[PDB]
Write a protein that binds this ligand. Structure first.
Ligand SMILES: *Cc1cc2c(cc1C)nc1c(=O)[nH]c(=O)nc-1n2C[C@H](O)[C@H](O)[C@H](O)COP(=O)(O)OP(=O)(O)OC[C@H]1O[C@@H](n2cnc3c(N)ncnc32)[C@H](O)[C@@H]1O
Ligand SMILES: *Cc1cc2c(cc1C)nc1c(=O)[nH]c(=O)nc-1n2C[C@H](O)[C@H](O)[C@H](O)COP(=O)(O)OP(=O)(O)OC[C@H]1O[C@@H](n2cnc3c(N)ncnc32)[C@H](O)[C@@H]1O
Ligand SMILES: C/C=C/c1ccc(O)c(OC)c1
Ligand SMILES: C/C=C/c1ccc(O)c(OC)c1
Lengths: 523, 525
């Protein structure tokens, strides 16, 4: 494949210059190597979102040279740390023929772990597993904040405004100090890193004038080669809980209970999750175990998952932190509040410890593990729900309100049911905001499921925008439709993003079209 | 006209004033010396025309702001917009360039637009100050508390945009900002984050949207004019109990810092950043200089010792506050007490152990901190203006790695430097979580040209020495902007040059407050 407006000789000359600056063993055009950077969870069938080549730079100097050669020959680039952005297009570029930079392959060192000041400095390739292991080996009484899959890049996940499940869940809030290669090949150090000799680079997200660290999120402005991540100091004790609710109709009550227990950062010291039974089922069992006809999951089938697994139609997971006096008081208030809802049931990772054959204990231990800074790949089990199960995220943000959540659930199961797509649901109250994660399970190998999933997600996006719900994160194929819903004053936001894009990337080199931000030369 | 922007003639300027008058109303466009002089830096450190606006305009709406900005583009007239214009120690309401037209949004755009108890936020216009917002919250009956700076006349919005801070767990004002309406440099209205989505109720809930957040860009910059801003408000805990800890040697500073860091980094038991004040700071809030020293040179060792002994405080005082149920406060207060009381000569009081008494100045100082730390705005710190006749300040505020070895270094160096120039040195350390602000608050004679030159030379002193040791200023007076911006020298000032690329993209005519934070529009470079 080949980037539109670039000839094979123009492309060949860039490749030969990439090969003499980095070494041809690190510049890959062989189909086998480039195939692996295609979207693992596609929802399209042709030559959309296909890389032409992938480069494995080994240093910040390497990245600078590649970027300079890309400007010289006007070759679009797409840089990433892990390339495992499943649900959002993985490692696939926005434009066909884009040259891909997998930084994580070689630039993958944990550079610093600082116990006294409780932060680490990581390169793109450090994933949750490696950092977890590097802290544990250092002896530092610090914990990480991982996402559900331990192969995620600590840096890359940050770049997407990605979140974990401890009090440090908002990764963008705790990143501090980036080394960024700007679109013209120059190195920038954000914050106090701009000051020779300063030890505050990973301490204070500030400097004279405005911070631009936030500019490098879900954006195409720069390539990050090093990043500081602030780490929660390990408390004396941690206790996880599960709360089981009997009824689909309990969803509003669960939200209305949660907001006043979360907003004051106590007794819910971390954002608790609310997932429907289908989500939990899929992490410990296969679909065929519960139904058999290929249609929408019936009420009879869902009911079997609740009874057999001994869980609820909705399940709340959370964790309390500190010494026991605090945990007991906090656990008592959480237990006390939620059990107002008739039929609710409350367990702890002590009352429901991990026992062999007990599935409800296995998926509590999974949440306890993530919530106490231990990464695992337990959610990967959803990929076996059926053969070739993959996902395609609809993730709107709304105010935390009982029947604000009920209509999103009630409208989302309708629209997924109309397309015969399985609907896995996870709600999160951050503090004042509510994330709805619709996690659809569709057959990645069957084009019928691909189109059914795209048409469905495009309908949910009209449905969300119509009800005042905005998507905060979107797959490559959804970028333009979602960008377009932020419509105030003739898309003044997209046009603001675009002025910044043209200021930092005058030549339109970095992953054109990311988040609906198109360079000047592509309008 | 009292002054003129460089490159604009008296008639070119007069023609621009007529259009402002035509579109906003002449009663809201003022060039008279009596009115504009009102808006000169109250704490100047220069003697001439430097930083003197030509006129002041009082817009009454966003739509008025837009019109003013479009006119300024047509006529090529630089603007400097502010909310309350009371940014004392940083240039007050003065602009970077002489002859700049000032926009005082707060005189008429001063409504509290909403108080939401369920979701614990309020929405304010530029004119709303801490006292106003507190009174509006209290009248609402919402169990919410604000986070003020020292002086209640400070603007909620204006302070946030200077990256300013209070003293509750909601101390980081820029953190709890959520949802701005901004007039851009071409007169076009932007709504940040979820404000972009018609119908969204999350505009002041989630500081996010598809793609980059740009709220961060309107901080210590000249890219836009904010007409409306959401500020998330801490829900009121069940109880709050403030404390002061008196330290006997001014050598106790390194021990105070080392004790504090493991108490603060985990957000407990120090639930908010305590401050570490020197004795001269606390004296100035409850007394005048000549009550301890008549001789006008640097404060001698006995003058400080007299302050320590008569007021019944320490050479260093720590002030903090615990929040939550009575069972939580009791556990936290005692970790804090036991940790600090291990410093020999230390004494601990709470606002129950040392309640407000008339004449008990120690009890007044603690009551003032107890008020700020529980969200009750006051002017108690305004007393420093009376330390002597015409006493004003001029901030040196570096940020460093929280280290007792750093704090002593910064204190000893700033003292030796301020003593060389005969300027009083009020010192306050605040330990954020993983970072330490050093606030150097000098007190100089704002009406004396000799003192202004001493203070400016002293601060240029201190910026060179901070830069020498790797201590960077995060906030500086107009007259300090270029020197401070130059300290961020990594890769031939890639930070400054990045600032300017964004400046030129959002302000192609270079209208908005040129030179703010070293960010010069292309046309002046
Ligand atoms: C299938 C799935 C996915 C998932 C999840 C559960 C399941 C079952 N749970 C998640 C969760 O709890 N939280 C979360 O944030 N994401 C979750 N996901 C999605 C996904 O697995 C993770 O987000 C994953 O960590 C993302 O992959 P990775 O970490 O490898 O990120 P990347 O692909 O390398 O980067 C993503 C994009 O960011 C920009 N980027 C990344 N690095 C750079 C650098 N160095 N410079 C510039 N830009 C960079 C690019 O836009 C890149 O494409
Ligand atoms: C003398 C003094 C000062 C002081 C202090 C103690 C003393 C004794 N303690 C402070 C503290 O604890 N925390 C803090 O943040 N500041 C403290 N100061 C300094 C000062 O008193 C306050 O910061 C004060 O709140 C600032 O003044 P104000 O609130 O009136 O802000 P402003 O002049 O309107 O704005 C300052 C600058 O911000 C930009 N700005 C402001 N509003 C806008 C709008 N609407 N649009 C665009 N930009 C805006 C401008 O650059 C303006 O100059
Ligand atoms: C099961 C949760 C998936 C997920 C995907 C994207 C996200 O941003 C996210 O935040 C918790 C979660
Ligand atoms: C006495 C405090 C002065 C001060 C000045 C500017 C600041 O940003 C500040 O932060 C606590 C404090």
């Amino acid at each position: 494949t080949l980037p539109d407006g670039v000839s094979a000789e123009q492309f060949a000359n860039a490749i030969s210059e990439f090969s003499e600056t980095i070494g041809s063993e690190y510049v890959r055009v062989d189909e086998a190597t480039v195939s692996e950077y295609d979207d693992k969870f596609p929802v399209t069938d042709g030559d959309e979102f296909k890389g032409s080549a992938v480069i494995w730079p080994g240093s910040t100097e390497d990245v600078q040279v590649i970027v300079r050669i890309a400007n010289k020959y006007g070759i679009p680039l797409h840089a990433f740390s892990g390339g495992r952005n499943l649900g959002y297009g993985g490692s696939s570029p926005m434009l066909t023929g884009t040259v891909l930079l997998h930084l994580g392959k070689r630039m993958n060192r944990v550079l610093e772990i600082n116990e006294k000041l409780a932060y680490a400095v990581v390169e793109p390739g450090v994933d949750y597993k490696t950092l977890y292991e590097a802290v544990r080996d250092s002896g530092a009484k610090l914990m990480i904040d991982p996402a559900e899959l331990d192969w995620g890049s600590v840096m890359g996940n940050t770049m997407e405004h990605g979140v974990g499940y401890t009090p440090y869940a908002d990764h963008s809030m705790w990143r501090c100090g980036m080394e960024v290669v700007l679109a013209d090949g120059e190195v920038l150090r954000t914050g106090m890193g701009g000051l020779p000799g300063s030890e505050a680079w990973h301490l204070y997200p500030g400097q004279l004038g405005p911070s631009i660290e936030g500019l490098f999120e879900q954006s195409n402005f720069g390539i990050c080669t090093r990043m500081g991540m602030q780490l929660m100091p390990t408390p004396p004790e941690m206790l996880s809980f599960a709360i089981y609710f009997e009824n689909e109709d309990d969803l509003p009550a669960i939200m209305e209970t949660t907001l006043p227990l979360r907003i004051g950062m106590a007794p819910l010291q971390a954002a608790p999750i609310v997932r429907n039974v289908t989500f939990d089922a899929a992490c410990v069992s296969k679909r065929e175990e519960w139904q058999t006809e290929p249609g929408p999951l019936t009420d009879e089938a869902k009911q079997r998952m609740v009874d057999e697994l001994g869980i609820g139609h909705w399940i709340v997971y959370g964790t309390c932190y500190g010494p026991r006096w605090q945990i007991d008081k906090y656990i008592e208030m959480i237990r006390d509040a939620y059990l107002q809802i008739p039929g609710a049931r409350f367990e702890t990772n002590e009352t429901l410890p991990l026992r062999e054959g007990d599935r409800a204990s296995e998926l509590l231990n999974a949440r306890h593990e993530l919530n106490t800074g231990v990464p695992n790949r337990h959610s990967a089990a959803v990929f076996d729900w059926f053969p070739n199960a993959g996902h395609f995220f609809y993730a709107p943000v709304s105010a935390p309100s009982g029947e604000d959540a009920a209509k999103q659930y009630e409208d989302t199961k309708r629209i997924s049911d109309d397309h015969g797509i399985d609907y896995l649901a996870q709600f999160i109250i951050g503090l004042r905001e509510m994330h709805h994660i619709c996690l659809p399970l569709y057959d990645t190998a069957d084009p019928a499921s691909r189109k059914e999933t795209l048409d469905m997600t495009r309908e949910l996006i009209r449905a969300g925008a119509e009800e005042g719900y905005g998507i905060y994160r979107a797959h490559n194929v959804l970028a333009d439709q979602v960008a377009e819903t932020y419509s105030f004053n003739n898309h003044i936001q997209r046009r603001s993003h675009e002025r910044i894009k043209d200021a930092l990337d005058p030549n339109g080199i970095l992953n054109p079209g990311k988040s609906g931000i198109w360079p000047e030369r592509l309008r």
